[PDB]
DNA sequence: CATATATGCCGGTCTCACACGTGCCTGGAGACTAGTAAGCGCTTCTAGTGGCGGTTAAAACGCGGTAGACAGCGCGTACGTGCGTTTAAGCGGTGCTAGAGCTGTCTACGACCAATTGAGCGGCCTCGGCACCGGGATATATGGTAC
DNA sequence: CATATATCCCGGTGCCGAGGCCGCTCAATTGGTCGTAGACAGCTCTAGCACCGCTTAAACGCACGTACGCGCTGTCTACCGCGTTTTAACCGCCACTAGAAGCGCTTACTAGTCTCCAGGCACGTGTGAGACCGGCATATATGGTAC
């Protein structure tokens, strides 16, 4: 017999089965196609990798091994497209970007 | 005794982390943020897909509804890449049946 | 002995707090205020500590955000000092009223 | 069968310094003396609005303990989505 | 010409207009607005009711979820009235079993 | 034999239709018997409130038929409706007459 | 000759347009703009007449709102005259601009 | 020559007056043109995305209504 | 004061959209069955509450003085008015047919089922990352002074 | 130029949270069943589009000049920086138990099905609300000029 996980067959790290269950148990439609949770799990995996890439770079610039919420904030707020996606979201313990208005600088 | 089974995307977030930054870790709180992020974008995409099906009198959310949802919700370059990554996973899954 | 000119320490403080992520309101005052306000909505409520940390993270992030918009309203008026009327204009344009 | 100490004037625990620090992180260099009372006003309205919704989720759950999740759903309701506390 | 059937609340908006203001009528555009309004509040309350049920691991949206929805959605006085009109009509409806 | 649950609850608004729309809208697996009555009642309440004020706006305007402007006038003058409909545009609604003081002549 | 002082007609026009609900953009220029902007996303498109009207209702309503907030930003700056920098601040605070 | 110029200095005045503007700097009209274009761009983009999804070649009022909803500009009176 | 013109109003005149009566047709509402969601008992035990005292960092206060808020001036021109001229929007029109969108036939697909099995979880243990500390290297802002 | 005071960046130290091993076990996988959603193609005919040529109204451009934006200046005091003194946060520990969270029983509730029956629809009307509007009446802005 088999059992190899739909994740394997789609070539994804994100769990297709779980995603299909959450769609079905989430009251979004009567029916959920077989491709839907594959496609979804792939988008969530792409966005994760994208932010983990920038955030790891922030951790390393910051001479640290470990991504902390500040590294996720630096990553998101310094990327134009992520910043817009998370425009109305608050990262606990993220702080803000260093930004002083020009007119407040001494002459 | 033996606390309740609380699901989480953490296992997957660590896997993608090790692919992209093999020597980089992540703190509890940072994992909390990644969990919230995946739950948030799930709901937003699921939500728009639901609306799309309903507007077209369809009973079924297919990869086509996900792909329109992704285009309405993601900014420019992020949507192009997400769509291409999603279409790839469907094609690969469709032929692995 | 030695004396920084007005605005030099303010600049230093902006650089300090913009680098850090630590909550800037003291924890106990903030909790007492949460307990007071909620009690007036309903007697004999308990709080998970993490429900108080969530409320304090949300409140401080709201106020930092408002203070940025308030600052822009001062600067638009050819001022460098934030005043109540800068908060009011920011809050009106934001649709908070 | 005991007592709860009664809570009074706790808005004043949002002191001048704490407000100044929040304004610093917001890039404010100079602060009118009237800003501190105005800020207390605005904070209180914010806490009231969010706690109102949180407690309503709590009462709905038949609970006597307000959870992080009640706070997180309330913040989500108000367009103030918060990551790091569940959901 | 084979008709083609599209529902609206217009009949019910007339029945209510005649209660509150028996000698006044309504333009078709104004009826469009009242139709947009009813569908909008429907979606808002149902949506909230939907989330209330999910958060509390419950399969059923009862009048209790509708009520809590109305408490989150409507401002103070509108909410108290709505809660009255709501509780009353459920009382009156069970008593006529 | 056979009467509306709308008349059993004393409502003009359709309890049957609302039950169907609830079931068909993927809000939940199942829907309580009370839910659609409660909801239909809340929609009737809010419809009466708007139409009451908008009706008034129609008289204050010497008109027997409510147009969109009457509804805009009715919603933006009521604190609580204005808030409920804070992010809604009423087509052909216009705005409230409102000039900023400093703009009026000396 | 006869001349109303500068500002007096401006006020009449305010009173006049705040009193009415008619669209203030000419329908055909607007319609050609809608069709143009849309070509750049999908070619060979037809529009329902009501779809152009919905878009014009939504745009005029948005611009009138924005002009209100702009007017407040001008007045905040001790002015009676809206400038681009008033529109910009309104948009920044609304969250439209970064 | 372009269609955006179809949104005239006078039509922009009228809109400013409805929003209670007494005096209008000359730089406003191009500034409004650019803002209006971004507004129509964002809205029509989503409207057309809905049209493509229904496999239609006609933009419906309902596509514009759903698009306005998504963008926080809910419009009553067109089939909401 | 008087004079100009914008705006409001009346009463009449018309027109077309509203709101009415008439099918008709579907989408519901009275049974009725049958299975599960959830209410409501009882238990477990987590984590929320309140209380105390050593320490000390944060808050508060008053002082002194500078730099920014604010008001008053005065200059220059960008605007608002109104006019005469040009342009194209709107309109009523008569086609002309893309395509919205409905019906009717037929797979392919997705739900449901209910045994089978490894993915993912809660524990549990444990070092290596990092928080915190103090030393010595700059970097800047301000003050003393020579020219 | 000189000097004072913040902040950097360095190892060094020690703590405890991330992250990896385990073994248990549900939720996901298989693979077979069956009902229907939706794909496809034909057909209809709604409504979107387009060329036309009047007829105004609205846009245009121009030229006048005023009230407003704007930069300068001078006044004064509110707000910053800092020293000293006060205060209550924090920490680390108690001790106590409310109520959150979980389980097992148990049954009204609800969905799923047929049948029927009338509620809500598209249609077709004809008629009064309101749009227009001519010309009249009222309200208000603007200036003249002589106190
Ligand atoms: Mn109290
Ligand atoms: Mn074509
Ligand atoms: Mn007189
Ligand atoms: Mn009349
Ligand atoms: Mn159960
Ligand atoms: Mn003292
Ligand atoms: Mn002064
Ligand atoms: Mn100048
Ligand atoms: Mn054809
Ligand atoms: Mn684990
Ligand atoms: Mn290890
Ligand atoms: Mn140190
Ligand atoms: Mn080091
Ligand atoms: Mn079908
Ligand atoms: Mn107990
Ligand atoms: Mn007239
Ligand atoms: Mn005068």
Author numbering:
A (entry chain C): 12 to 118
B (entry chain D), E (entry chain H): 26 to 122
C (entry chain E): 38 to 134
D (entry chain F): 16 to 102
F (entry chain G): 13 to 118
G (entry chain A): 38 to 135
H (entry chain B): 23 to 102
Text taken from the publication that reported this structure:
DSB recognition by and activation of PARP1 is proceeded by actual phosphorylation of H2A.X13, which ultimately culminates in γH2A.X foci formation to induce a cascade repair response. Here, we produced γH2A.X using a hybrid chemical approach and assembled nucleosomes with either H2A, H2A.X, γH2A.X or mutants of H2A or H2A.X as the incorporated H2A variant. Nucleosome stability/dynamics investigations and crystallographic structure characterization were carried out in combination with surface plasmon resonance (SPR)- and bio-layer interferometry (BLI)-based techniques to measure the kinetics of PARP1 association with and dissociation from the DSB constructs (represented by the blunt-end DNA termini; Homo sapiens histone and PARP proteins). Additionally, enzymatic assays were performed to shed light on the catalytic parameters of PARylation. This reveals that PARP1 recognition of and activation by DSBs is modulated by histone variant composition and post-translational modification status.
